[PDB]
Amino acid sequence: MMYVKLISSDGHEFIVKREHALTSGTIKAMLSNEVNFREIPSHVLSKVCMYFTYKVRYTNSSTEIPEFPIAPEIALELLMAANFLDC
Amino acid sequence: KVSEQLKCCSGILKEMFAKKHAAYAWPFYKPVDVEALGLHDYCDIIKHPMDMSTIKSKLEAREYRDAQEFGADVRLMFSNCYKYNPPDHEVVAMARKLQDVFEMRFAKMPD
Amino acid sequence: MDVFLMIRRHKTTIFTDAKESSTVFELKRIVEGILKRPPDEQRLYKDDQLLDDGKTLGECGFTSQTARPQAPATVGLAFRADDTFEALCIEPFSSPPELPDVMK
Amino acid sequence: PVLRSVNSREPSQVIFCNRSPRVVLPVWLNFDGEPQPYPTLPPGTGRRIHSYRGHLWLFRDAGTHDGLLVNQTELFVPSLNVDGQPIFANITLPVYTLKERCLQVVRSLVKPENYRRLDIVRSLYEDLEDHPNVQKDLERLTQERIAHQ
């Protein structure tokens, strides 16, 4: 599959599949190859990628779906990140 | 003498199960599922439960001494339904409808 | 079942899925396809433990139960330079702020 | 009203099975269409249910009133039993959006009155305060049902 590089504010490169990234409507618009984010930190953006994996996998899944975990501390930043990325 | 009637008793229950009297006999087919219906109080009130499926088994297992004992269980079935529910309840209305059929046949049994 | 991984070197991180049946060498082919680096110039680790090319990901310890989509298991990576392998180095992510009073 | 149970008085044995981590709240739409909440189901549990033919159901989280799925759909309607076999209702989580899932966590850790004490964008205050409502979701499905005709 086509891969895309998602860079955090603190300079952490995250190589995910293009299909997985298109879950985000913001990224969908940004492309139509390499994408950069000035605000989002590493630990937040890493968790966003884990959602893409989780979303792509368990969508249209007859296998019962587990709860997507979000620790109390990251919740606030991840909420804003999710709102920004539109997903 | 008695075996003649016990076979007629089976004939009655077959009509009670039959599609003819389906509309108002369907609650009394199988035992009262306390879990499904959510009746925590039922077991306290009704000491001796009964249903048509239970009676059917007893007929086939030759557990009724005579046709008189068969009636007691059929009556116990309705008795329990009347005991538990209020007068204006739907299951009671159906209980009466089915009972009035049974009573008609049980009365007109040969001997 | 499938295992979900985070292949990390320095500040790089590859999110990619694999099988328990698949091998470490087959995993290095994924790294080659992305980072242009051939398997002979790769060293894949599990925590501190170095992994063999012949052994499977299931044999290495990566189970589908432990390594899930939402919680993928990390896989260390170290390249070769001047015909000598670097020691495994993974920069950690940034720290979340301490839990506010309202969230306590 | 559109979405409502039919007073059929025709039996339909059902099995609710909470295959989700939430404490499920079974909700039954009455003959007028008003939802009636039934006793909850713990996580990873189930039990037999005596519903009737053409009876609408929907399942939520007892705590947060988050929407759940039953047989990969929102509304559940029992058929008639075939050879008196029970109609199964597999209650599970949906694939929540990262935003709505983030809200659920913030909602659970922060009281309603502390929503405007959080260092976030103005718009997110409305989103948090906009809790998941049953009546609001029924109004959507009703309009979607009309659009389908």
Residue numbers in the entry:
A (entry chain C): 16 to 47, 58 to 112
B (entry chain A): 349 to 459
C (entry chain B): 1 to 104
D (entry chain D): 61 to 209
Sentences copied from the publication:
PROTACs are bifunctional molecules composed of a ligand for a target protein of interest, and a ligand for an E3 ubiquitin ligase, joined by a flexible linker. Recruitment of a protein close to an E3 ligase hijacks the ligase catalytic activity, leading to the tagging of the target protein by ubiquitination and subsequent proteasomal degradation. Our first crystal structure of the PROTAC MZ1 in complex with the E3 ligase VHL and its target, the second bromodomain (BD2) of the bromodomain and extra‐terminal motif (BET) protein, Brd4, revealed that the two ligand moieties of MZ1 (the VHL ligand, VH032, and the BET inhibitor, JQ1) lay in close spatial proximity within the ternary complexes. Inspired and guided by the crystal structure of the ternary complex between our BET degrader MZ1, VHL, and Brd4BD2,10 we designed a series of macrocyclic PROTACs with the aim to lock the PROTAC in the bound conformation.
Macrocyclization was achieved by adding a second linker to “close a circle” between the two ligand moieties of MZ1. KGaATo validate the binding mode and deepen understanding of the molecular basis for the biophysical properties of macroPROTAC‐1, we next co‐crystallized VHL:macroPROTAC‐1:Brd4BD2 and solved the structure of the ternary complex at a resolution of 3.5 Å. The structure superposes well with the ternary complex VHL:MZ1:Brd4BD2 (Cα RMSD=0.6 Å) and recapitulates the major PPIs between VHL and Brd4BD2. Conserved contacts include the previously reported electrostatic interactions between Arg107VHL, Arg108VHL, D381Brd4(BD2) and E383Brd4(BD2); and the stack between the canonical WPF shelf of Brd4BD2 and Pro71 of VHL. Collectively, these interactions result in a buried surface area (BSA) between the two proteins of 681 Å2. The MZ1‐portion of macroPROTAC‐1 binds in an identical S‐shaped conformation to the uncyclized PROTAC, retaining the H‐bond between His437Brd4(BD2) and an oxygen atom on the PEG‐3 linker. The cyclizing part of the linker optimally fills an additional cavity created at the interface of the two proteins next to the ZA‐loop of Brd4BD2, which is in good agreement with the MD simulations. The BSA at the macroPROTAC‐1:VHL and macroPROTAC‐1:Brd4BD2 interfaces are 961 and 1064 Å2, respectively, which brings the total BSA to 2686 Å2. Closer examination of the additional linker revealed potential clashes with the ZA‐loop, which could explain the loss in binding affinity with the BET bromodomains. Within the ZA‐loop, the side chain of Leu387, as well as the carbonyl oxygens of both Gly386 and Leu385, are less than 3.5 Å from the newly added linker.
